[PDB]
Design a protein around this ligand. Structure first.
Ligand SMILES: CCOC(=O)CCc1ccc(-c2ccccc2O)c(O)c1
Length: 156
């Protein structure tokens, strides 16, 4: 898709000039070794001073041929403990749904900062996984304990 590929080249240029420290976003390769702009491997650092601190959380960003009409699918690989991340790893966030708050102008940097913000501030209104949501509601201390253990597990 020429439209998607043109926009994704624009995103790649912008990202290299200006990206938040400690974040990673890199296109993958096709089986012939050429660049695949439709599939990016990314990493989000936990914010300092939070239970997420010290972790580097890997996620894949998958673009459909009609991007930027549609948002990319964002999937933590491996899946994470968080009330708004599905057991599959897929992130549940309003800016990542075409019918909700997605706008074609939204950039990869804005998506990744949006997901980082979500990590430290769950949305109790759209629970995506039972366990993390239930613990968040029932025992915030236990929740943060689980988050810190996870951050340690994913230290780079
Ligand atoms: C992407 C090149 O590797 C680095 O920049 C180190 C940080 C990193 C960033 C992303 C990934 C990753 C993310 C999603 C899916 C598979 C991966 O390997 C990973 O394994 C490692």
């Amino acid at each position: 898709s020429g439209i998607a590929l043109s926009r994704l080249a624009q995103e790649r240029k912008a990202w290299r000039k200006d990206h938040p420290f400690g974040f990673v976003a890199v296109p993958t390769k096709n089986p012939d070794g050429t660049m695949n702009l439709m599939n990016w491997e990314c990493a989000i650092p936990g914010a300092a001073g939070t239970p997420w601190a010290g972790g580097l959380f890997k996620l894949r960003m998958l673009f459909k041929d009609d991007y930027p009409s549609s948002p990319p699918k964002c999937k933590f690989e491996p899946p994470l403990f968080h009330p708004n991340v599905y057991p599959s790893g897929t992130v549940c966030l309003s800016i990542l749904e075409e019918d909700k708050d997605w706008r074609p102008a939204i950039t990869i940097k804005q998506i990744l900062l949006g997901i980082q913000e979500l990590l430290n501030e769950p949305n109790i209104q759209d629970p995506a996984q039972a366990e993390a949501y239930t613990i968040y509601c029932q025992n915030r201390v236990e929740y943060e304990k689980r988050v810190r253990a996870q951050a340690k597990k994913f230290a780079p």
